[PDB]
Design a protein around this ligand. Structure first.
Ligand SMILES: *[C@@H]1O[C@H](CO)[C@@H](O[C@@H]2O[C@H](CO)[C@@H](O[C@@H]3O[C@H](CO[C@H]4O[C@H](CO)[C@@H](O)[C@H](O)[C@@H]4O)[C@@H](O)[C@H](O)[C@@H]3O)[C@H](O)[C@H]2NC(C)=O)[C@H](O)[C@H]1NC(C)=O
Length: 197
């Protein structure tokens, strides 16, 4: 169970977790105690895995990680909303490719500045099957592998840029790779012990 290699989601030690890949046998996720997990991949297709919550919110999250990408990969707060269907990213670090596209401005929060981009993803896998949907991006100007993310400040920034979110679905601190190799170990948590709304 702890070593996931098949599409799967669930709960581990209180944290929701999700694993998805279109390339079987090229990547695995290992769930550890608390809010920790690891990933290892090699010449994979595409995958997204991480721990977090099944219902996103304006959470203030703290994480620490070892991110060792060998090519295209992301260390990012990742999530989905419905109606409208939106896949969003708060990118903390990346490999060889830095997310880009239509510049919507910037947002300063948690000791750093992030560039804001909005792009489209065509006929791609989603929490609602094969769909075309928009992607909201907050990309830090300085890569980092630990710190705090006041998610609320990003949502506000996106909103002020005409990027409207829908009804929140899952929200996780994820590792995503694309036709690359690498590994990661990520530890995340929320401030205090408020529970889930
Ligand atoms: C988890 O569920 C995923 C679905 O969300 C599974 O993804 C599928 O993974 C298989 C490989 O096991 C891919 O099969 C290949 O398909 C390509 C053609 O791809 C194009 O057409 C499909 C049509 O559905 C489209 O989805 C793609 O985006 C491409 O446009 C062939 O050339 C290969 O020979 C091979 O058949 C599927 O493409 C892929 N589908 C999706 C939705 O991405 C995934 O397998 C599951 N993971 C595990 C570990 O089982």
């Amino acid at each position: 169970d702890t070593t996931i290699t098949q599409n799967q989601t669930g709960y581990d030690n209180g944290y929701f977790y999700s694993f998805w890949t279109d390339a079987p046998g090229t990547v695995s996720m290992t769930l550890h105690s608390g809010g920790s997990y690891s990933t290892s991949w090699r010449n994979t297709g595409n995958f997204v895995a991480g721990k977090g919550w099944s219902t996103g919110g304006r959470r203030t999250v703290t994480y620490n990680a070892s991110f060792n990408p060998s090519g295209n990969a992301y260390l990012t707060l990742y999530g989905w909303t419905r109606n409208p269907l939106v896949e969003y990213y708060i990118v903390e670090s990346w490999g060889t490719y830095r997310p880009t596209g239509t510049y919507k401005g910037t947002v300063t929060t948690d000791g750093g500045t992030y560039d804001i981009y909005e792009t489209w993803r065509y006929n791609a896998p989603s929490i609602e099957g094969t769909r075309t949907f928009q992607q909201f991006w907050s990309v830090r100007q300085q890569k980092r592998t630990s710190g705090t993310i006041t998610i609320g400040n990003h949502f506000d920034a996106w909103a002020r840029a005409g990027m409207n979110l829908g009804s929140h679905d899952y929200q996780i601190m994820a590792t995503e790779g694309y036709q690359s190799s690498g590994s990661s170990t990520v530890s995340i948590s929320e401030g205090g012990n408020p529970g889930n709304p």
